[PDB]
Coordinates of N, CA and C and ligand atoms in Angstrom, one line a residue:
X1 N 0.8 -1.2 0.0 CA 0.0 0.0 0.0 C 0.9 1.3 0.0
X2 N 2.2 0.9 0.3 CA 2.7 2.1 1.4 C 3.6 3.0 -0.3
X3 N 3.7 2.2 -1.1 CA 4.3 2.7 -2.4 C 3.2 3.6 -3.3
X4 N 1.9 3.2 -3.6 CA 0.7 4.0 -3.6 C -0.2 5.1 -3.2
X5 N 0.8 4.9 -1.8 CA 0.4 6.1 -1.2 C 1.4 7.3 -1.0
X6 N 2.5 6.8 -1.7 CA 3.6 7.8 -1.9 C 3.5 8.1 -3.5
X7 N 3.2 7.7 -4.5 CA 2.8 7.8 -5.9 C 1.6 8.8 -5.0
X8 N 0.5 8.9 -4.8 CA -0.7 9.5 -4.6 C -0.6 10.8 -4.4
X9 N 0.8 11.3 -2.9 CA 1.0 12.7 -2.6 C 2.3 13.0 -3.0
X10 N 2.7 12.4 -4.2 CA 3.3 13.1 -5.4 C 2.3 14.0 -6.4
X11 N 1.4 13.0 -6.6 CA 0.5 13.3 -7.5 C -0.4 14.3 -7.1
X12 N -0.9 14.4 -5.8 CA -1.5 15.3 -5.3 C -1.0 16.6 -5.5
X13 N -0.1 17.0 -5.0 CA 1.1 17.9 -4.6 C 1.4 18.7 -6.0
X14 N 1.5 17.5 -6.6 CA 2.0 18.2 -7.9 C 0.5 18.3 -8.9
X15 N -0.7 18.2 -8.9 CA -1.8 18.5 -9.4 C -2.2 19.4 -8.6
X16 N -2.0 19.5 -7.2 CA -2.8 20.8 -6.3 C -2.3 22.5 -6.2
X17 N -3.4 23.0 -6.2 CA -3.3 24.1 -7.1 C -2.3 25.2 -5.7
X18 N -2.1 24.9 -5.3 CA -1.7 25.5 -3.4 C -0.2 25.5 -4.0
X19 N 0.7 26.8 -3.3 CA 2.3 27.2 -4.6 C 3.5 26.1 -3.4
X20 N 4.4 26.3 -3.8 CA 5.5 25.5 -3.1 C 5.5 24.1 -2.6
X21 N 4.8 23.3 -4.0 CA 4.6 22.5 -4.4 C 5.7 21.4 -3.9
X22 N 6.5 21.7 -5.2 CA 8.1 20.6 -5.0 C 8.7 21.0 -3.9
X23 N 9.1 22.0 -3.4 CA 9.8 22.1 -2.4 C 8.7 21.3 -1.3
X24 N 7.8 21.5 -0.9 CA 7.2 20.5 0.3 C 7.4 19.3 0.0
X25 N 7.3 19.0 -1.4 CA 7.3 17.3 -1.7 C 8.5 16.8 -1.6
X26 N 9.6 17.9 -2.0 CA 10.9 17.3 -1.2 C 11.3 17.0 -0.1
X27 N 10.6 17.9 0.5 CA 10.7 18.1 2.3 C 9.8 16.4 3.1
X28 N 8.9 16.7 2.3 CA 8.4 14.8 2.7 C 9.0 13.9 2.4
X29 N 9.6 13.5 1.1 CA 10.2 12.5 0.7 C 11.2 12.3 1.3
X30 N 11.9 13.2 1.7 CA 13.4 12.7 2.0 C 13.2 12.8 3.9
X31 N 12.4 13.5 4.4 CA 11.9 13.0 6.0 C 11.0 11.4 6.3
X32 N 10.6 11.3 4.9 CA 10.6 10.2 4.6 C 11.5 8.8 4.4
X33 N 12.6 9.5 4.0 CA 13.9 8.8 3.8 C 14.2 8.2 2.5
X34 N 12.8 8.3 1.7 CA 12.9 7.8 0.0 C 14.1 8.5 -0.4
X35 N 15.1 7.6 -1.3 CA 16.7 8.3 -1.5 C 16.0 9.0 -2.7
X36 N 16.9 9.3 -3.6 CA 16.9 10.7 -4.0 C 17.2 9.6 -5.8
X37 N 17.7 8.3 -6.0 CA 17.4 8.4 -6.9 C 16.4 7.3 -7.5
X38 N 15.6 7.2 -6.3 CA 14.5 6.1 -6.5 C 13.1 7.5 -6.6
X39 N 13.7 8.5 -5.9 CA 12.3 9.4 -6.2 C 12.6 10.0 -8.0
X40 N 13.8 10.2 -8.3 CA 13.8 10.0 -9.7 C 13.4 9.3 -10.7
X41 N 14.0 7.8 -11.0 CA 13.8 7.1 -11.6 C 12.4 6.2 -11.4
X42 N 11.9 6.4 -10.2 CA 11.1 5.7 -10.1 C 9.8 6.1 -9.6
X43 N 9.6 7.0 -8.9 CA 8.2 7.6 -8.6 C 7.7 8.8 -9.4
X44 N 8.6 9.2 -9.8 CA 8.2 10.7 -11.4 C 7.8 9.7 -12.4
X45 N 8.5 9.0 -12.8 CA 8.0 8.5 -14.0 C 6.5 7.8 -13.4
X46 N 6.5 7.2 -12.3 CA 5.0 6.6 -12.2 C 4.0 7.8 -11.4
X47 N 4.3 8.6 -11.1 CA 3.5 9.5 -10.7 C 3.2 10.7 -12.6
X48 N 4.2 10.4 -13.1 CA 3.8 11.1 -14.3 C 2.7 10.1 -15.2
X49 N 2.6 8.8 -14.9 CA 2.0 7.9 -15.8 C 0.5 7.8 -15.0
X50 N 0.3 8.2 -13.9 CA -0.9 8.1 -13.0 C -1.5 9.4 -13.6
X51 N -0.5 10.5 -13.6 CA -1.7 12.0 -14.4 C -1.8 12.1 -15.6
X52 N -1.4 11.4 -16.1 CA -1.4 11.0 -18.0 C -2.5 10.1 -17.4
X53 N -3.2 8.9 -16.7 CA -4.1 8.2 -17.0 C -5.4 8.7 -16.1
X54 N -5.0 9.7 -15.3 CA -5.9 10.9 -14.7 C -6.5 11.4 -15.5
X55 N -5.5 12.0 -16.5 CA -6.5 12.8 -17.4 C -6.8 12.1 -18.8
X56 N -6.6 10.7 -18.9 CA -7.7 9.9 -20.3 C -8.8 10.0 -19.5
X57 N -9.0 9.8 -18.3 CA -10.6 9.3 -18.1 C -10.9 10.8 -17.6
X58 N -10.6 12.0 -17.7 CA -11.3 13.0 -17.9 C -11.3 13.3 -16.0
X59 N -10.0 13.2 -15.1 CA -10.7 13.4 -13.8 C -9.9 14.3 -13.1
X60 N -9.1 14.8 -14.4 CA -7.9 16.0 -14.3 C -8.0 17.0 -15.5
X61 N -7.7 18.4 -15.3 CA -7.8 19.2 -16.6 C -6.7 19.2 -17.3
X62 N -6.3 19.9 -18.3 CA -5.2 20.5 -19.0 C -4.3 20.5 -18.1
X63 N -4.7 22.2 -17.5 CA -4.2 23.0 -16.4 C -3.4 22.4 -15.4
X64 N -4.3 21.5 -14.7 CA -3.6 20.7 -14.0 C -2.8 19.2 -14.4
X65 N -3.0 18.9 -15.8 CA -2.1 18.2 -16.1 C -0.9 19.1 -16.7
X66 N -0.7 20.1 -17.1 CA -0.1 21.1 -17.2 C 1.3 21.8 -16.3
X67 N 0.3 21.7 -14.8 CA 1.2 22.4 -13.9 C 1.6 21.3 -13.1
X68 N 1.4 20.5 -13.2 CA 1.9 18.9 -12.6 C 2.9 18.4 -13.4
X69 N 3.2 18.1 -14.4 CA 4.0 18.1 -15.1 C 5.3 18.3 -14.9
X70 N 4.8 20.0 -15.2 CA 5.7 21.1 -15.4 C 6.3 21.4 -13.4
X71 N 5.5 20.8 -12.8 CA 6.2 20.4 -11.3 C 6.9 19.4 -11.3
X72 N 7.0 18.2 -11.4 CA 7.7 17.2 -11.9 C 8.9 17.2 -12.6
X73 N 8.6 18.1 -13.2 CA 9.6 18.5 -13.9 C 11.2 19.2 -13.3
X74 N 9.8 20.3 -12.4 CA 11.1 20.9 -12.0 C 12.0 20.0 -10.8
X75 N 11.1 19.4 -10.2 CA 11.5 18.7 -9.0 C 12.6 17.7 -10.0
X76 N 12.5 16.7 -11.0 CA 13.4 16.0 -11.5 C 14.6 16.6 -11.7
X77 N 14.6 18.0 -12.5 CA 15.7 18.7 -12.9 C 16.5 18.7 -11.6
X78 N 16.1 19.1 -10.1 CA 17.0 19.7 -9.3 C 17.3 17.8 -8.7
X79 N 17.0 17.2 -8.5 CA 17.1 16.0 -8.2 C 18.6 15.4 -8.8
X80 N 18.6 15.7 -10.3 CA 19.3 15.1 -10.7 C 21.2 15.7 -11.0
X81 N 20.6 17.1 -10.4 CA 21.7 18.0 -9.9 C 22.4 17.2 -8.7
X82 N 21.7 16.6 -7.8 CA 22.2 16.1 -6.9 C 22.9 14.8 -7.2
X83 N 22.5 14.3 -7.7 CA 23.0 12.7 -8.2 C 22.7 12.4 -9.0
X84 N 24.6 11.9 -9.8 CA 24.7 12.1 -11.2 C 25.3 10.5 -11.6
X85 N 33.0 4.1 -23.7 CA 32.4 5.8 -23.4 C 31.8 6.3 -24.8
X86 N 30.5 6.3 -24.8 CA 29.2 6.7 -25.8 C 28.5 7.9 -25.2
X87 N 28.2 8.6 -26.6 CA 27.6 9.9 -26.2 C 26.5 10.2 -27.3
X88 N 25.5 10.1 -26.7 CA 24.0 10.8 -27.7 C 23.6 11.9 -27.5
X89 N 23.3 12.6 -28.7 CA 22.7 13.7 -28.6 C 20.7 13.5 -28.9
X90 N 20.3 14.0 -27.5 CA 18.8 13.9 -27.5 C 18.6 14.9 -27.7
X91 N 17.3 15.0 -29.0 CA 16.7 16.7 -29.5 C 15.2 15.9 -28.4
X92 N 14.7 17.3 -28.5 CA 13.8 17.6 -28.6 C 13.4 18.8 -29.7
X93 N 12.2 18.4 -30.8 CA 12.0 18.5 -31.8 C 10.9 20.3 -31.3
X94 N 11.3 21.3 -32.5 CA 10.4 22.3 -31.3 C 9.1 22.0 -31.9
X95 N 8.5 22.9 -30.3 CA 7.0 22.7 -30.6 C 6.7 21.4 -30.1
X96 N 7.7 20.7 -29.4 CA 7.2 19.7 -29.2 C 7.2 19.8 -27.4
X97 N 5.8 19.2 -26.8 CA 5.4 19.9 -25.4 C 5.9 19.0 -24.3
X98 N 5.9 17.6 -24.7 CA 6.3 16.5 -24.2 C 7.6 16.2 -24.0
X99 N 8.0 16.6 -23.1 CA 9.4 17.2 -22.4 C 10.0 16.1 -21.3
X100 N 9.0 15.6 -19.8 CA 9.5 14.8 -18.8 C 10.0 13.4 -19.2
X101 N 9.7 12.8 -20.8 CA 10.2 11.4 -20.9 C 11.4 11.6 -21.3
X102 N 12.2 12.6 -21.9 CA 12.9 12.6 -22.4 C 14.3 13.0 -21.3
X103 N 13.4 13.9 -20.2 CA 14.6 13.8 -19.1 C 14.8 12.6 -18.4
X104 N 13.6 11.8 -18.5 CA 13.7 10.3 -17.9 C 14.8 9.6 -18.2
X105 N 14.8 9.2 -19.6 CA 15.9 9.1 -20.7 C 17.0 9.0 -20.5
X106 N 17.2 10.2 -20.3 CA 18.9 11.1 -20.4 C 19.3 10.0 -18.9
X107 N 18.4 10.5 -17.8 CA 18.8 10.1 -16.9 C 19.0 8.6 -16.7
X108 N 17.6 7.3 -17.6 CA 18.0 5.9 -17.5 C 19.7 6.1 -18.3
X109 N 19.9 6.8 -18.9 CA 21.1 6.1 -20.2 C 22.4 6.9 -19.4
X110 N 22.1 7.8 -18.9 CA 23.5 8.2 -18.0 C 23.5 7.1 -17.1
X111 N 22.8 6.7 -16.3 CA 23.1 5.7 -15.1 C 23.5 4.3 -16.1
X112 N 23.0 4.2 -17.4 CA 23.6 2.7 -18.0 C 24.9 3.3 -18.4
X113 N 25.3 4.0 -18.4 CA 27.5 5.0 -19.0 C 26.7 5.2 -20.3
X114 N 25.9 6.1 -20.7 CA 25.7 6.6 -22.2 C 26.0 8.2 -21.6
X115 N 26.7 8.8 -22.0 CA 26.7 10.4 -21.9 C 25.7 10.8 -22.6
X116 N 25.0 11.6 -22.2 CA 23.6 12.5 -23.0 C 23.7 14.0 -22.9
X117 N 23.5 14.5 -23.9 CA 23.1 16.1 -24.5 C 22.4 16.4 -25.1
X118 N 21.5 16.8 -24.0 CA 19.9 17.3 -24.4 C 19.4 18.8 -24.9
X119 N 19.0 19.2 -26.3 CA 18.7 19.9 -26.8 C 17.9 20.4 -27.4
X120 N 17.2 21.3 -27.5 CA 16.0 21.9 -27.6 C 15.7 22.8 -28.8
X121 N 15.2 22.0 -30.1 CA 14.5 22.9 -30.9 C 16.0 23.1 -31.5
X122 N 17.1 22.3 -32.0 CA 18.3 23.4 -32.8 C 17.8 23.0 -34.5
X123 N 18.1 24.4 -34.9 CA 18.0 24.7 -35.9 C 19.5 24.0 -37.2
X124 N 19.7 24.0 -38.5 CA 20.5 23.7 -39.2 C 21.8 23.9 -38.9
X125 N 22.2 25.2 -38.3 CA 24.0 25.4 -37.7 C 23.6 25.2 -36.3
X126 N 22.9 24.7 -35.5 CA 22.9 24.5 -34.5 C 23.2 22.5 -34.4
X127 N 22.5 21.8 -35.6 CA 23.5 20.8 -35.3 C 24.4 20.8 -35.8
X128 N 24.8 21.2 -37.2 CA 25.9 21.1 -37.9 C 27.3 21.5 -37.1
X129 N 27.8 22.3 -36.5 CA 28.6 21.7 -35.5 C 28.9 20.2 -34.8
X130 N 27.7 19.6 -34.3 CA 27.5 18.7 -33.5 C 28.1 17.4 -34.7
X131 N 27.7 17.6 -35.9 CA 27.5 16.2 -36.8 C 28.8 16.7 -37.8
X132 N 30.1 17.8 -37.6 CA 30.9 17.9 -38.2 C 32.1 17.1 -38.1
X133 N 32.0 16.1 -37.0 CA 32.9 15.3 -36.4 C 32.0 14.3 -35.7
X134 N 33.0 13.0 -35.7 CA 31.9 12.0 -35.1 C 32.0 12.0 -33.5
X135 N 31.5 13.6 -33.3 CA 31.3 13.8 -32.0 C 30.7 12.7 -30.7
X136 N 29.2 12.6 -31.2 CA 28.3 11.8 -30.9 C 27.5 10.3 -31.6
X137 N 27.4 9.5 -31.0 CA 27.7 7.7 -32.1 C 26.3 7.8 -32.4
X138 N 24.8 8.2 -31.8 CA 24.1 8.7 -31.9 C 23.6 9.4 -31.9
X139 N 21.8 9.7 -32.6 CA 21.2 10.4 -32.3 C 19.6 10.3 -31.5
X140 N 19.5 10.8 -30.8 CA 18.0 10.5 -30.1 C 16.6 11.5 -30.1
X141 N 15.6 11.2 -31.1 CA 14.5 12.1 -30.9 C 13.2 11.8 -30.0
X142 N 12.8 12.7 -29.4 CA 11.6 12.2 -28.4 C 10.3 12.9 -29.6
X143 N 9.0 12.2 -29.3 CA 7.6 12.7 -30.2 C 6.5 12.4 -29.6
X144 N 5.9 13.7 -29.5 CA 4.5 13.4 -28.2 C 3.3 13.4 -28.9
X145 N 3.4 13.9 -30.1 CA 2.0 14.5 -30.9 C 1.9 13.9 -32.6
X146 N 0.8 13.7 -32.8 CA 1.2 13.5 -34.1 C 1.8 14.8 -35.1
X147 N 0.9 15.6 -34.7 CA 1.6 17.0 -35.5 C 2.9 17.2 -35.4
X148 N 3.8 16.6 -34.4 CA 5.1 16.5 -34.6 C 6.1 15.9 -35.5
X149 N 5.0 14.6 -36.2 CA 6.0 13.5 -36.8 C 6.6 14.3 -38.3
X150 N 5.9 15.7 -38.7 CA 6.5 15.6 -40.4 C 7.9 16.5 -39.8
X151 N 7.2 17.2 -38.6 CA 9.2 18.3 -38.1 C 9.9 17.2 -37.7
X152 N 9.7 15.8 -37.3 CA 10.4 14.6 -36.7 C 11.0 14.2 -38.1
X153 N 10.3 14.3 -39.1 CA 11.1 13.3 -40.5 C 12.1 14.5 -40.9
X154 N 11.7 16.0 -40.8 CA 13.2 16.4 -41.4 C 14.0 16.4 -40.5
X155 N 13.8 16.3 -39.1 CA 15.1 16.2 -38.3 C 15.4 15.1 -39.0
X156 N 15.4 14.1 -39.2 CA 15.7 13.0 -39.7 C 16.7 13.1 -41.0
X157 N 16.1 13.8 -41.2 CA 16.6 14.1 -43.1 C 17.0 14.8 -43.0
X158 N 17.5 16.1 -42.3 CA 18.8 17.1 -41.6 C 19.9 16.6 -41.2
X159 N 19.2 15.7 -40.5 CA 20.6 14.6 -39.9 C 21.2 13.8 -40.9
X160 N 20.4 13.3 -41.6 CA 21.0 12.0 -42.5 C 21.7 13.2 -43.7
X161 N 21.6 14.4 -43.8 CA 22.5 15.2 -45.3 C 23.5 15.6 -44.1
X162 N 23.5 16.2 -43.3 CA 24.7 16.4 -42.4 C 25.7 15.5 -42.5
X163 N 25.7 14.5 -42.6 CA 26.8 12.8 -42.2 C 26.2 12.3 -43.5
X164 N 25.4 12.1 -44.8 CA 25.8 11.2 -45.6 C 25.2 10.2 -44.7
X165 N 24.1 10.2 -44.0 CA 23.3 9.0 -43.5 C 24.4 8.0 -42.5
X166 N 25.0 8.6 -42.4 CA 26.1 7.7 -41.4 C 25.7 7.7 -39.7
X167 N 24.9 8.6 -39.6 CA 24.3 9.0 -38.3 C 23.1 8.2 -38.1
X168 N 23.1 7.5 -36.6 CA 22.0 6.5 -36.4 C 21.2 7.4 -35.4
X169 N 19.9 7.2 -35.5 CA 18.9 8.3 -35.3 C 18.1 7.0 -34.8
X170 N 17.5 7.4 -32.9 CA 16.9 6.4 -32.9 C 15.2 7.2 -32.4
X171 N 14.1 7.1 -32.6 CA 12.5 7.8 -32.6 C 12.4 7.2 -31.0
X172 N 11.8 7.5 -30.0 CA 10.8 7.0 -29.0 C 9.6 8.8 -28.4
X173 N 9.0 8.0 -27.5 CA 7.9 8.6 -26.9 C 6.2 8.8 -27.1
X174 N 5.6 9.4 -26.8 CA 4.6 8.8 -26.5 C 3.5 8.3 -27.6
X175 N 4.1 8.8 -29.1 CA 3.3 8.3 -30.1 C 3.9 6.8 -30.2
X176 N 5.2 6.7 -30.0 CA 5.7 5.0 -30.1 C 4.6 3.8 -29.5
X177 N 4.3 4.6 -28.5 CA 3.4 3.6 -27.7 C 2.1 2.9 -28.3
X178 N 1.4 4.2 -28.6 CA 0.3 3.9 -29.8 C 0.4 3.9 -31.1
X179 N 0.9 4.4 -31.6 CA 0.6 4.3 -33.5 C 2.7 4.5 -33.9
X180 N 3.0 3.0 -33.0 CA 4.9 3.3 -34.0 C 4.7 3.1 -35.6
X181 N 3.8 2.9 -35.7 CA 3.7 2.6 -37.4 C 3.5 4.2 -38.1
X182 N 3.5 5.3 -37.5 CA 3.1 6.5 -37.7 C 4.6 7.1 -38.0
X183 N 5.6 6.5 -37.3 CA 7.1 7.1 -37.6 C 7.7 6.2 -38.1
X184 N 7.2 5.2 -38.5 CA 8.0 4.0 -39.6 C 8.2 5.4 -41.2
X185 N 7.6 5.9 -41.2 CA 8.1 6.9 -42.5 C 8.8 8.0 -42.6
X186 N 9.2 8.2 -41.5 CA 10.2 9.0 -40.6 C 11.8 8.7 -41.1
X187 N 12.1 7.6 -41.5 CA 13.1 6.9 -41.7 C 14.0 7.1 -40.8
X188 N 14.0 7.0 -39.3 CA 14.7 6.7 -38.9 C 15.6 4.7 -38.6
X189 N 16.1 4.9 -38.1 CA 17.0 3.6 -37.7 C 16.0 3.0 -37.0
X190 N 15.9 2.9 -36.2 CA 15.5 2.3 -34.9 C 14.0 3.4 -34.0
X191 N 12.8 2.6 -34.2 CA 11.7 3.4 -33.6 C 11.3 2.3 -32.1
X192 N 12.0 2.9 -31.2 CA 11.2 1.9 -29.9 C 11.3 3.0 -28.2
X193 N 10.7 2.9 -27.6 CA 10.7 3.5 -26.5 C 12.1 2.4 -25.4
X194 N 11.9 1.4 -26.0 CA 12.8 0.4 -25.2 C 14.5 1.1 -25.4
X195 N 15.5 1.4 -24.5 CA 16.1 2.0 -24.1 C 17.7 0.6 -24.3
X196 N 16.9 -0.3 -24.0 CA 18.6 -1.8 -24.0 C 18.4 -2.0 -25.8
X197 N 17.3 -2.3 -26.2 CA 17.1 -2.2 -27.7 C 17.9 -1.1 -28.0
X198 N 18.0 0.5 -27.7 CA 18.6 0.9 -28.3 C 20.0 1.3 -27.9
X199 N 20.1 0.7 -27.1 CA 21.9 0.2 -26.7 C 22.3 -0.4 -27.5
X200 N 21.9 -1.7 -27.5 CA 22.0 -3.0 -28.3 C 22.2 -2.8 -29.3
X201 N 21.6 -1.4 -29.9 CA 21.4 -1.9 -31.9 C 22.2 -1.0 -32.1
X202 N 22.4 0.0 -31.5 CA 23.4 1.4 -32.0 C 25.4 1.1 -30.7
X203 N 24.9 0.1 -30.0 CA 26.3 -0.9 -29.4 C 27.1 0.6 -28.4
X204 N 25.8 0.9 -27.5 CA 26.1 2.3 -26.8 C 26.9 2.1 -25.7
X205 N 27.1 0.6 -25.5 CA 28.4 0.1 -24.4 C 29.2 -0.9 -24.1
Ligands
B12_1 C1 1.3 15.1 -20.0 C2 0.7 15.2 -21.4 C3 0.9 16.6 -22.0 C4 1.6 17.7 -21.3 C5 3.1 17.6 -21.4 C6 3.8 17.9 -20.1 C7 5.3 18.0 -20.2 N1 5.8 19.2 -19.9 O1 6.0 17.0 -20.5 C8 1.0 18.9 -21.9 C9 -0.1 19.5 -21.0 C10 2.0 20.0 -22.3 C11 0.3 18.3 -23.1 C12 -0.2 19.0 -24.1 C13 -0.1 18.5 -25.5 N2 0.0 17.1 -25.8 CO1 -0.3 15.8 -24.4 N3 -0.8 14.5 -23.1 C14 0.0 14.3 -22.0 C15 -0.2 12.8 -21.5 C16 -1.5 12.9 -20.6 C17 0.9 12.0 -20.8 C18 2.2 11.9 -21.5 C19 3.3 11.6 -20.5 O2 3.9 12.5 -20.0 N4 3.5 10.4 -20.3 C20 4.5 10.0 -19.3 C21 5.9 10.0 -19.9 C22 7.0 9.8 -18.9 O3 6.0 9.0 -21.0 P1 6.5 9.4 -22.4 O4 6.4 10.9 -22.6 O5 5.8 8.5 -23.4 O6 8.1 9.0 -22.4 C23 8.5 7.7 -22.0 C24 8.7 6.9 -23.3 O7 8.1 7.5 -24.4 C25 10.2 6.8 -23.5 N5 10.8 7.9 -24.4 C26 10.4 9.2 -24.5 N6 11.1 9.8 -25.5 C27 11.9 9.0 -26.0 C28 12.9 9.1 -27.0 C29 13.7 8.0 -27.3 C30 14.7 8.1 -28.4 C31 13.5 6.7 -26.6 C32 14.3 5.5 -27.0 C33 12.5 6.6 -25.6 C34 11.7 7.7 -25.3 O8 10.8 7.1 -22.2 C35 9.9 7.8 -21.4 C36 9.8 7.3 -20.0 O9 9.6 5.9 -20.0 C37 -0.5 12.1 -22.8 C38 -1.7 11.1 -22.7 C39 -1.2 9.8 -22.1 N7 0.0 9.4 -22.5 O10 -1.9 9.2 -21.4 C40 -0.7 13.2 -23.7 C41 -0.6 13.2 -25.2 C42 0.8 12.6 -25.6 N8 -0.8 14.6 -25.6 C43 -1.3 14.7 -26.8 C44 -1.4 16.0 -27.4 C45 -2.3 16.0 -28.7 C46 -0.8 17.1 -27.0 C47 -0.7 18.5 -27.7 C48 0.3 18.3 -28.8 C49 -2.0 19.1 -28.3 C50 -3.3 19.0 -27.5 N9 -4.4 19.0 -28.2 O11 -3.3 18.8 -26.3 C51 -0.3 19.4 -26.6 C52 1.0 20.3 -26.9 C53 0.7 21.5 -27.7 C54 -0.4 22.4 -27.2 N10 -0.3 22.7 -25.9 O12 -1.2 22.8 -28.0 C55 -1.8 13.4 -27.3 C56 -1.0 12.9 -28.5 C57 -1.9 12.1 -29.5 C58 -2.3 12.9 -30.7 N11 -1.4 13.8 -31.1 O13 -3.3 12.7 -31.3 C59 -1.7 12.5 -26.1 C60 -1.4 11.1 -26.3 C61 -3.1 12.6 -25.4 C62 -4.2 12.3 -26.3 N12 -4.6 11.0 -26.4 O14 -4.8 13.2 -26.9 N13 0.3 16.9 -23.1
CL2 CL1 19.5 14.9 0.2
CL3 CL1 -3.3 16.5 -23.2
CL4 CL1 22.1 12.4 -14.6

């Protein structure tokens, strides 16, 4: 029970509209004694999957799926300040709102020895730098919306004229889950949310 009811005044906390949110939820957790990278890895992502299934059945708004989130968020960022050879570069594609899986990510594939560099929205000389040397052995895109998948295929296709297609480009997030047949035309390498799959295929250790 006792793991459910700590998922719950995560969730609470961070849906409740009352300000200093994460800082109290810090203040519990760790008087609690929950370490610091089990409330990472393991209670954000299930307290972010409890308000994602909050709001299919309609028992949470935007707003507060919104500002829960975007609390979660902040709470993981400072988390992971505290507690911290392949190197990926993770975009996030702009415009694209679905942000927390991708710090999940960074954080499962740092703790497996993947170095990660997470970026936001770069434009044509913003990776060309990155892809003028085989800086990085991969590349990683996150995709929350369908409206994202045609800016998802020219990242794709920016990347692959940068390098001459030499660049492995692997798709996940939350459209993978339901329709991965929607970024099979994407051309990327590798479309899976699974994380050792894309160790495995792109040989990240
Ligand atoms: C939270 C959420 C949001 C939040 C985002 C909060 C944030 N800052 O991150 C907000 C409120 C911004 C939001 C709004 C939108 N989103 Co929204 N919302 C959700 C919701 C409820 C949960 C998604 C979530 O966070 N899941 C939990 C996280 C941790 O999982 P994840 O993101 O899938 O990531 C995991 C995996 O995908 C994987 N992973 C992620 N990225 C990558 C990358 C790689 C390379 C790999 C290997 C793995 C990987 O690892 C992660 C951890 O395991 C879902 C519905 C649902 N899923 O139940 C939608 C959903 C994704 N949203 C959707 C939509 C449509 C939107 C909007 C684009 C438009 C709209 N009409 O709402 C907007 C954004 C633009 C706008 N505002 O106009 C749709 C997408 C389907 C579609 N397009 O038809 C969904 C599915 C809801 C729905 N059924 O309508 N959303
Ligand atoms: Cl501490
Ligand atoms: Cl939504
Ligand atoms: Cl980290």
């Amino acid at each position: 029970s006792l793991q459910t009811v700590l998922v719950n005044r995560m969730v609470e906390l961070a849906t409740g509209p009352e300000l200093g949110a994460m800082d109290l939820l810090f203040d519990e957790f760790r008087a609690a004694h929950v370490p610091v990278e089990e409330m990472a890895t393991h209670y954000i992502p299930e307290a972010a999957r409890q308000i994602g299934a909050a709001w299919d059945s309609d028992r949470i708004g935007f707003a507060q799926v919104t500002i829960a989130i975007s609390r979660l968020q902040e709470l993981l960022h400072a988390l992971q300040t505290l507690v911290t050879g392949a190197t990926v570069l993770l975009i996030v594609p702009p415009g694209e709102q679905h942000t927390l899986g991708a710090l999940i990510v960074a954080m499962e594939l740092r703790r497996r020895g993947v170095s990660v560099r997470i970026v936001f929205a770069p434009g044509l000389s913003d990776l060309s730098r990155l892809m003028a040397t085989t800086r990085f052995d991969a590349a990683l895109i996150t995709v929350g919306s369908m409206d994202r998948v045609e800016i998802c295929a020219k990242l794709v296709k920016t990347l692959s004229s940068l390098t001459k297609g030499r660049m492995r480009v692997a798709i996940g997030g939350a459209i993978v889950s339901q329709r991965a047949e929607a970024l099979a035309r994407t051309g990327a390498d590798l479309v899976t949310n699974d994380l050792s799959l894309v160790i495995s295929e792109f040989s990240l250790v």
